[PDB]
C-alpha cells in the first residue's frame, strides 16, 4: 500500500542503524520492522504460520493483561475479592465459600474445579475447532481476519483504515505480550502483584527497583 507503515520506506527496528532488511521481509504485512536476525522466516509457509501465531498470541495476551490488571485495581479500591492478585486468583476455588465473582456470594458461586475444567475444555475445543475450520459464524472467511459477524460495527470497510487498524492492533498486541512477560517475571521474582510493584516503585524509585532483588537467586 501507500502509507507510512508499508513499503520500503517503513520505519525499522534499529532506526538509522538497521541497514537493509532481509529480502523476504518486503514490508507488505502489519508491524513489519524487518527484525528477523535469527532467520526463522526464510520459508514463506513458516512465515505465514509465525504470523498467525503472533496474532493469536497478541490477542490472548491483550486479554490477559487487562484481566490481570482490572481485578487487582478493583480490590485495591475496596472490592472484597477472594484473591485480588492475578497469580493467586486460581486458588479461590479451594476456599470454603468457593469462587465468588466480584466477591458476591450470589455471583457464580462455583464450588467444583472439575466441572469448570470440563466445561472449559468442551467450549474451548468447539471454539478453536470453529476458528480453524469454518463454523456457524461464517465458513469461507480469512483465518486471521474473518470479519463479518466478528466486525459488527463496520470499522474495517475502508482498506486504508483496515491497514491502519491492523498495524495498531499488532503494535498494541506486541506491547501487551511484552508486558505479560514482565508480569510473569515480576511475579516469580518479587512475589507481589503488579500494582503493588508499581506502588512500591513510586514510593521510592531510588531503591525500590529490580536491582534490590538482584542478590536473590545467587547460589550458596
Amino acid at each position: 500500500p501507500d502509507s507510512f507503515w508499508y513499503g520500503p520506506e517503513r520505519p525499522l527496528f534499529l532506526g538509522a542503524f538497521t541497514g537493509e532488511p532481509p529480502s523476504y521481509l518486503t514490508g507488505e504485512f502489519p508491524g513489519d520492522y524487518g527484525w528477523d536476525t535469527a532467520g526463522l522466516s526464510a520459508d514463506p509457509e513458516t512465515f505465514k504460520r509465525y504470523r498467525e501465531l503472533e496474532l493469536i498470541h497478541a490477542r490472548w495476551a491483550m486479554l490477559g493483561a487487562l484481566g490481570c490488571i482490572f481485578p487487582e485495581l478493583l480490590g485495591s479500591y475496596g472490592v472484597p475479592f477472594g484473591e485480588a492478585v492475578w497469580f493467586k486468583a486460581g486458588a479461590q476455588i479451594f476456599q470454603e465459600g468457593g469462587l465468588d465473582y466480584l466477591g458476591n456470594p450470589n455471583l457464580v458461586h462455583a464450588q467444583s474445579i472439575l466441572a469448570i475444567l470440563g466445561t472449559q475444555v468442551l467450549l474451548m475445543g468447539a471454539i478453536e475447532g470453529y476458528r480453524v475450520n469454518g463454523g456457524p459464524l461464517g465458513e469461507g472467511l480469512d483465518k486471521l481476519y474473518p470479519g463479518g459477524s466478528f466486525d459488527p460495527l463496520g470499522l474495517a470497510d475502508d482498506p486504508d483504515t483496515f491497514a491502519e487498524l491492523k498495524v495498531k492492533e499488532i503494535k498494541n498486541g506486541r506491547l501487551a505480550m511484552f508486558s505479560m512477560f514482565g508480569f510473569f517475571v515480576q511475579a516469580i521474582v518479587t512475589g507481589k502483584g503488579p500494582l503493588q510493584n508499581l506502588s512500591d516503585h513510586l514510593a521510592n524509585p531510588g531503591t525500590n527497583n529490580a536491582f534490590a532483588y538482584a542478590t536473590k537467586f545467587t547460589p550458596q
Partner: protein, 160 residues
C-alpha cells in the same frame, strides 16, 4: 361451513359465529393479523402454563403467590439472586422492548407470524407441504388448549 373460512390455513375449524373475520362492503363519504395475534397469545399461554406447572411441582409455592416472596427475597429454583425489584424491572423492560421492537419491524406478514431462520435450529420447516402444515396445526391447537387452560387457572385463582 362459513364462506369466509377459505381453509388452507392451520386453524381452519369453521368457528366464527359473530363474523369477526368476515369481510364487509364499505362506503367512503386482514385474516393474517388475527392469525398472528392468536399465534402470539397462544405461544405466551403455553409458556405461562408450563412455567406455572413447573413452579408448582419444584418449589411448591403458588403461582399467584409468586412475586411477594420474590420482592422480599429474589430466588430462582431455590437459589438466591443478587437483584432488586428496580434492576429486575429495568432489565426486563429493556430486553423485552428490544425483542418487541425487532419483532414488529417486518413488512412481510408471513415472516412476521413464522420467522423461522435462527429460531428454527433443526431444518424442520424446509419446503414440505403436508407434514409441516400438520405440525403447524399441532402448534395452533396446543396454543388454544393452553389459552383455555390458563383462563381456567386464572378463574380458579379468583374466589380462592
Amino acid at each position: 361451513r362459513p364462506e369466509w373460512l377459505d381453509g388452507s390455513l392451520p386453524g381452519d375449524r369453521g368457528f366464527d359465529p359473530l363474523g369477526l373475520s368476515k369481510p364487509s362492503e364499505f362506503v367512503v363519504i386482514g385474516l393474517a393479523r388475527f392469525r398472528e395475534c392468536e399465534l402470539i397469545h397462544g405461544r405466551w399461554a403455553m409458556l405461562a402454563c408450563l412455567g406455572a406447572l413447573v413452579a408448582e411441582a419444584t418449589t411448591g409455592v403458588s403461582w399467584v403467590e409468586a412475586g411477594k416472596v420474590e420482592l422480599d427475597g429474589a430466588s430462582y429454583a431455590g437459589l438466591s439472586l443478587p437483584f432488586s425489584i428496580t434492576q429486575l424491572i429495568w432489565i426486563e423492560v429493556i430486553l423485552v422492548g428490544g425483542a418487541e421492537f425487532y419483532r414488529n419491524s417486518e413488512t412481510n406478514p408471513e415472516k412476521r407470524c413464522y420467522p423461522g431462520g435462527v429460531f428454527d435450529p433443526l431444518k424442520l420447516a424446509s419446503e414440505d407441504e403436508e407434514r409441516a402444515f400438520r405440525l403447524k396445526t399441532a402448534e395452533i391447537k396446543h396454543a388454544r388448549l393452553a389459552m383455555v387452560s390458563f383462563f381456567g387457572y386464572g378463574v380458579q385463582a379468583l374466589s380462592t
